[PDB]
Amino acid sequence: NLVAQRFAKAGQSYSKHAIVQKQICQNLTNLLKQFCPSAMSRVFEIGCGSGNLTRLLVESFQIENLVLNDLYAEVQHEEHVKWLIGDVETLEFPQQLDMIVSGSALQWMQDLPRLLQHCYAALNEQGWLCFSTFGPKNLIEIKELTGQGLNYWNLENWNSALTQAGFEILHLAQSETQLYFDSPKAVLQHLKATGVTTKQSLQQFYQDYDRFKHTEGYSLTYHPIYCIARRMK
Amino acid sequence: SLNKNLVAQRFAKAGQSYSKHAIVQKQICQNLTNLLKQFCPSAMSRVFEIGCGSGNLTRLLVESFQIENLVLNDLYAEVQQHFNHEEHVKWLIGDVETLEFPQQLDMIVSGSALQWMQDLPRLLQHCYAALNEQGWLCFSTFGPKNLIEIKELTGQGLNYWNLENWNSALTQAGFEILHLAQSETQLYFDSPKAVLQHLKATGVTWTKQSLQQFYQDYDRFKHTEGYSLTYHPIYCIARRM
Amino acid sequence: LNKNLVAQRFAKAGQSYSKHAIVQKQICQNLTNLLKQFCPSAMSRVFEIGCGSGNLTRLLVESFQIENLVLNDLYAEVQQHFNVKWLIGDVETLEFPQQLDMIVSGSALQWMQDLPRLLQHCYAALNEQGWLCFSTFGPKNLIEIKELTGQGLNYWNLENWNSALTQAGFEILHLAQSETQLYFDSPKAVLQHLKATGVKQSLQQFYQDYDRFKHTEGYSLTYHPIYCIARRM
Amino acid sequence: MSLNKNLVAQRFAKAGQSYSKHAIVQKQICQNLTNLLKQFCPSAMSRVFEIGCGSGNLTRLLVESFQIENLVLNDLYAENHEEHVKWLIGDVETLEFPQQLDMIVSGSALQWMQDLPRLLQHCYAALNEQGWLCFSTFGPKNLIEIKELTGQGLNYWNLENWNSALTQAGFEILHLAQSETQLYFDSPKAVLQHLKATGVQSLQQFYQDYDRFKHTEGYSLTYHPIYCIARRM
Numbered sequence: 021n022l023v024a025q026r027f028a029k030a031g032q033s034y035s036k037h038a039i040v041q042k043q044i045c046q047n048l049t050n051l052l053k054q055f056c057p058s059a060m061s062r063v064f065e066i067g068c069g070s071g072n073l074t075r076l077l078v079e080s081f082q083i084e085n086l087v088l089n090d091l092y093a094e095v096q097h098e099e100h101v102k103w104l105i106g107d108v109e110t111l112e113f114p115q116q117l118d119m120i121v122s123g124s125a126l127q128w129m130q131d132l133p134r135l136l137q138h139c140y141a142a143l144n145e146q147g148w149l150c151f152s153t154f155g156p157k158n159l160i161e162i163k164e165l166t167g168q169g170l171n172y173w174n175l176e177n178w179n180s181a182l183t184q185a186g187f188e189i190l191h192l193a194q195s196e197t198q199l200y201f202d203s204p205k206a207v208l209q210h211l212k213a214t215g216v217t218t219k220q221s222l223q224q225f226y227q228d229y230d231r232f233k234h235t236e237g238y239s240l241t242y243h244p245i246y247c248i249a250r251r252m253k
Numbered sequence: 254s255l256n257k258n259l260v261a262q263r264f265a266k267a268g269q270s271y272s273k274h275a276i277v278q279k280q281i282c283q284n285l286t287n288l289l290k291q292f293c294p295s296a297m298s299r300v301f302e303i304g305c306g307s308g309n310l311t312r313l314l315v316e317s318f319q320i321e322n323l324v325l326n327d328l329y330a331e332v333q334q335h336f337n338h339e340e341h342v343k344w345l346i347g348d349v350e351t352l353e354f355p356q357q358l359d360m361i362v363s364g365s366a367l368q369w370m371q372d373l374p375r376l377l378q379h380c381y382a383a384l385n386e387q388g389w390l391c392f393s394t395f396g397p398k399n400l401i402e403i404k405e406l407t408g409q410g411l412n413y414w415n416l417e418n419w420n421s422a423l424t425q426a427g428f429e430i431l432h433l434a435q436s437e438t439q440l441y442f443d444s445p446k447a448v449l450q451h452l453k454a455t456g457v458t459w460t461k462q463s464l465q466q467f468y469q470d471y472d473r474f475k476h477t478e479g480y481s482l483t484y485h486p487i488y489c490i491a492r493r494m
Numbered sequence: 495l496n497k498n499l500v501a502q503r504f505a506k507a508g509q510s511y512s513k514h515a516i517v518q519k520q521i522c523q524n525l526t527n528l529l530k531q532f533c534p535s536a537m538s539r540v541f542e543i544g545c546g547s548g549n550l551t552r553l554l555v556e557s558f559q560i561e562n563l564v565l566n567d568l569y570a571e572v573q574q575h576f577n578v579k580w581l582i583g584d585v586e587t588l589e590f591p592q593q594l595d596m597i598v599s600g601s602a603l604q605w606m607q608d609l610p611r612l613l614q615h616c617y618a619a620l621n622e623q624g625w626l627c628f629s630t631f632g633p634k635n636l637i638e639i640k641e642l643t644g645q646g647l648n649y650w651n652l653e654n655w656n657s658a659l660t661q662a663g664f665e666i667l668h669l670a671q672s673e674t675q676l677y678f679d680s681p682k683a684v685l686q687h688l689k690a691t692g693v694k695q696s697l698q699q700f701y702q703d704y705d706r707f708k709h710t711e712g713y714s715l716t717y718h719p720i721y722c723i724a725r726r727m
Numbered sequence: 728m729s730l731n732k733n734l735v736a737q738r739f740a741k742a743g744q745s746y747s748k749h750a751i752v753q754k755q756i757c758q759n760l761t762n763l764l765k766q767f768c769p770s771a772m773s774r775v776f777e778i779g780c781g782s783g784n785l786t787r788l789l790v791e792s793f794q795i796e797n798l799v800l801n802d803l804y805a806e807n808h809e810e811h812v813k814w815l816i817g818d819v820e821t822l823e824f825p826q827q828l829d830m831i832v833s834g835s836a837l838q839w840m841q842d843l844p845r846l847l848q849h850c851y852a853a854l855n856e857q858g859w860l861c862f863s864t865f866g867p868k869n870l871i872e873i874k875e876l877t878g879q880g881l882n883y884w885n886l887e888n889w890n891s892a893l894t895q896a897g898f899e900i901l902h903l904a905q906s907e908t909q910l911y912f913d914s915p916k917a918v919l920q921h922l923k924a925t926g927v928q929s930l931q932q933f934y935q936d937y938d939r940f941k942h943t944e945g946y947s948l949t950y951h952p953i954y955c956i957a958r959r960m
C-alpha cells in the first residue's frame with residue numbers, strides 16, 4: 021500500500037504573519053495523522069511551550085499517558101498528563117514510549133547525537149520519533165545584520181544523525197518561506213509580537229535591510245525542517 | 254494588497270516520504286481544504302462545487318464549513334448515488350460549460366476537475382458573473398508535467414495550463430489571486446505493473462503484446478527507489494475583484 | 495384594481511364523446527388556451543417541469559416566442575423525444591434557473607412530495623409579476639382504481655391550492671377544476687386504456703368489482719384535472 | 728399491431744374562478760366553439776354554411792383551421808374576397824339553403840330565430856349524410872339580471888328543448904353542454920358600459936335595483952351559452 025516518493029512545492033501566498041509558528045505545528049500534525057495510528061498509549065513532548073502542538077495532539081490522537089517537557093510550565097484527564105520540567109538534556113526520559121514529538125525546540129539543543137541516544141533507548145521497537153526544527157537559513161536576515169542566531173543542522177546532517185543513531189526515516193522535508201514586510205520596522209514588530217526577540221544601531225539596522233528589499237517588501241526567512249522517523253527495524 | 258496584518262509570502266518545499274499510492278486524490282482534496290481553512294470564513298450561505306464526483310472534497314467541505322445552500326455539479330446523473338439526499342443540497346447535472354451557473358454565490362470550489370474543461374477563459378467569465386462581490390474562487394487542478402510518464406509511452410494525456418497562464422487568465426477575468434501554488438510528486442513503484450494497477454485502482458483507466466513492451470519502455474523512468482509516476486497538482490485561492 | 499379585467503365565476507357541464515387515448519394531450523390543450531388568455535406572446539425565459547414526451551412543450555413553442563427554454567424531467571431518457579437547455583433530475587432536488595418569465599408544468603406536480611416549499615423556489619426563481627401556470631389533478635382522479643386496488647395518490651383539492659399559493663406569495667388569476675367520467679364498454683377496456691396511456695383471479699375479481707361503477711352508457715373512469723394561472727406579487 | 732381510435736361516451740363538469748377582459752366575451756365563445764369543431768370535424772371540408780356571421784370573428788377562426796372549398800356567409804348585413812366566398816343576405820328563415828353541405832355552423836345567432844323547428848327541417852335537407860350541424864347559442868339564464876330589472880329579454884331554449892328538437896328533426900348529438908358565467912363589475916354603470924361596448928331619471932333607481940345582485944366581488948351579469956355538435960342521419 022505504501023510507496024516511496026520525492027516532492028517539490030512552490031507558490032506565492034498571503035500570511036497573517038502573526039500565525040507563522042502555529043501553522044508549523046499544524047503542518048507537523050498533518051504528517052502525524054498520515055503515518056501514525058489514531059490510538060497511542062504513551063507519548064513524550066519536548067519543548068511544549070504554550071501548548072499549540074499539545075492541543076493539536078490530543079484532539080487528533082487518543083493517548084493514555086502524556087509527558088510534557090519544557091523549561092517552564094506555561095501551557096495554561098489530568099493524572100494522565102505529567103510534567104517533566106528543566107533542560108531536557110539534563111533529564112532522564114520516560115521509558116517504553118510509543119512516540120516522542122517535538123516542535124520548534126530541537127534547534128536549542130547543544131548535543132543532538134547524545135540526545136538521540138536517549139530517544140532510542142526510551143522508545144519501543146518501531147517507536148515513532150517525529151519533530152519539527154529549523155534549517156540554516158532560519159531568520160538569516162537577523163543573523164547577518166546583528167551577528168546573532170543559532171548554528172542549524174541541514175537535512176543531510178539530520179539524515180546521517182538519525183541513521184547513525186539507529187533510526188529509520190519515513191519522512192524528511194524542508195521549506196524556505198520568505199515573508200515580505202512593508203518596512204524593516206514591521207519586521208522587528210513581528211519578532212516581538214511572536215516572541216522571538218543605541219538609537220544609532222536601530223536606524224543603521226534599517227539602512228542595511230535594503231540588501232533584503234525585494235519588489236514585494238523586505239524579506240524575513242523561516243526555514244522549518246520536518247521529519248518522521250521510526251526506531252530500529 | 255493595501256490591507257494590514259497580512260503579509261506577502263514566497264515558499265518552496267522539498268523532501269522524501271512514503272505515501273499510500275491509492276490515497277493521492279484524497280491527499281489533494283485534503284491539501285485544498287487546508288487552504289480553505291486559512292483564507293475563507295467558517296460560514297458561507299451559498300457554495301457551488303464543480304465536478305463533485307465521488308465526493309471526497311464534498312465530505313471535507315461540509316465538516317469544516319457551515320453552508321446554508323450547497324449546489325453540486327457533475328457530468329453523470331448517477332453521481333447522486335454516492336450521496337444521500339439532504340434538503341440544503343441542490344443538483345446541477347451535466348457539462349458545466351453548457352449550464353447556467355447558480356446565482357449569488359459566496360464561493361465556487363472544484364477539486365481536480367477543471368483540467369477537463371475545453372474553454373477555460375469562458376468559464377472564468379461565468380464564475381465572475383455568479384460570485385458576489387469579493388466572492389471566493391478556490392480550485393485544485395493539474396499542471397503540465399501531470400502523468401508525463403503515461404503521456405510519453407502511450408501518446409495520450411491532456412493539455413494543462415501552468416501557473417502564469419492561470420495567473421494571466423484570472424487577472425483579466427476580474428479575479429485577484431490570494432494563493433497560487435504547485436507541487437511535483439514522483440511516486441516510485443516496484444514495477445511498471447504496479448503503475449498500471451495503481452492507475453486502474455484509483456479509477457484513472459491491447460494486452461500481453463503491447464503490455465510487455467510498455468513494461469520495457471518504462472525502464473527509462475526507473476530510479477533506484479523504483480519506477481516513477483508524476484503528479485502535478487495546482488492550487489489556487491482567488492477572490493472576485 | 496385593473497380597469498379592464500373583471501372578477502368571474504363559471505360552471506359548465508355536458509355530455510360528449512372522446513377518443514379515450516388523447517386525454518393527456520387534451521389536458522395540455524386546455525392549459526395552453528389558458529396560457530393564451532393571460533400571458534404575453536413573448537417571454538425570454540421559460541422553465542417547464544416534467545416535460546415528458548413533450549406534449550405541452552410543442553404547444554408552448556408553437557404559440558409563444560421564447561429565447562431561453564429550460565426543460566426538466568426525472569429521466570434523461572426523454573431527450574430522445576426532442577431535437578433548449580436541459581435540467582435532468584428530481585425538480586425538488588434541482589437548482590432552479592433564475593430570473594424567469596414563466597414556470598410551466600403539465601400533469602406533473604401531483605408527484606411532488608413537498609409542494610409548499612417547491613413553491614418557495616417558484617417564488618424566488620421568478621421575476622416580479624412572473625407567471626406560474628400548471629395543471630395537476632384533484633382528489634377524485636382515477637378514484638375507481640383507488641377504490642378497487644387501494645393504490646393511487648393523495649391529491650390536493652382547490653382549497654388546498656388556494657391556501658398554499660397565497661401563503662407562498664402568489665396571486666391567482668385563474669383557478670378551476672373539471673371532473674370527467676369516460677364510459678367504457680367493459681372493465682377490460684378500462685385496463686386496456688390505462689396501459690395504452692402509460693399509467694388470474696385477481697383479474698376476474700377486478701372485472702366483478704367494477705360492476706359497482708356501471709352506468710347507463712358504460713363503465714366509469716374519472717379524471718379530475720385542476721387548472722391554475724398564478725402570478726408572483 | 729393496431730392503432731387506437733375508439734370514441735367513448737363522456738360526461739363532464741367544470742367550475743372555477745377567473746379574471747377576464749369584459750370586452751372579450753363573444754370572441755371567447757367563438758374560440759370555445761372552434762375548439763369543439765377541431766375535436767370532432769375533419770380538417771378538410773368542401774362546402775360550409777354559416778348563419779349569422781356578423782363581424783366575422785368566427786369566420787376568421789373557421790378558415791384559419793379548416794380547409795374549405797366553398798364558403799357561404801349569411802347575415803342580415805355584410806361586414807380576402809375570393810371567388811369561392813358567397814354572400815346570402817337577409818332573414819335566414821326566409822331564404823332557401825345552399826345544398827349538399829358538409830357543415831352548417833352558427834355562433835351566437837340562433838337565439839333570434841322565430842321558428843327553430845322549421846329551420847331544423849331546412850338544415851336537414853341541405854346537409855349531406857352524416858353532415859355536421861354545430862352551433863353556439865344561449866340558455867334561459869342569459870342576461871337574467873337585465874331581464875328582471877328591465878322586464879325585457881328573449882325567450883331561450885334550455886338543454887332539454889334542444890335535445891328533443893334535434894332528435895326530432897333527425898339529428899344525432901355528439902356533444903351537448905352549457906355554461907353559466909357570472910361577471911362581477913364594480914358598479915352597475917360599468918355593466919351598462921359593457922352592454923354598450925359589446926354591441927348590445929330612472930337610471931339612478933336601475934342602479935338602486937341592481938343592489939339585489941351585489942356579491943362581495945361586485946355586481947353580477949350572467950352569461951349562459953350553449954354548445955352543441957350534431958351530425959345528420
Ligand SMILES: C[S@@+](CC[C@H](N)C(=O)[O-])C[C@H]1O[C@@H](n2cnc3c(N)ncnc32)[C@H](O)[C@@H]1O
Binds near residue numbers: 071
Ligand atoms: C519555539 S517554542 C515551541 C512552542 C510550540 N508550542 C511548539 O511546540 O512548537 C520552543 C520551546 O522549547 C523550549 N526549550 C528550549 N530548550 C529546551 C531544553 N533544553 N529543554 C526543555 N525545553 C527547551 C523553550 O522553553 C521553548 O518554549
Ligand SMILES: C[S@@+](CC[C@H](N)C(=O)[O-])C[C@H]1O[C@@H](n2cnc3c(N)ncnc32)[C@H](O)[C@@H]1O
Binds near residue numbers: 279329347349365
Ligand atoms: C478526478 S474526478 C474528481 C472527484 C472528486 N471530487 C475528487 O476530486 O476527489 C473529476 C470529475 O470531474 C467531472 N467532470 C469532467 N468533466 C466535466 C464537465 N465537463 N462538467 C462537469 N463535470 C465534469 C467528472 O465527472 C469527474 O467525476
Ligand SMILES: C[S@@+](CC[C@H](N)C(=O)[O-])C[C@H]1O[C@@H](n2cnc3c(N)ncnc32)[C@H](O)[C@@H]1O
Binds near residue numbers: 547551567599606
Ligand atoms: C404525466 S407526465 C407529463 C407528460 C407531458 N409531456 C406533459 O408535460 O404534459 C409527468 C412527467 O413528470 C415527470 N416527473 C415526475 N416526478 C418528477 C419529479 N419529482 N421531478 C421532475 N420530473 C418529474 C415524469 O418523468 C413524467 O414524464
Ligand SMILES: C[S@@+](CC[C@H](N)C(=O)[O-])C[C@H]1O[C@@H](n2cnc3c(N)ncnc32)[C@H](O)[C@@H]1O
Binds near residue numbers: 753
Ligand atoms: C350577435 S351576432 C354574433 C356574431 C359573431 N361575430 C359570431 O358570429 O360569432 C349574431 C348575428 O346574427 C344575425 N342574425 C340575427 N337574426 C338573423 C336572421 N334571422 N337571419 C340572418 N342573420 C341573422 C345578426 O345580424 C348578428 O350579426
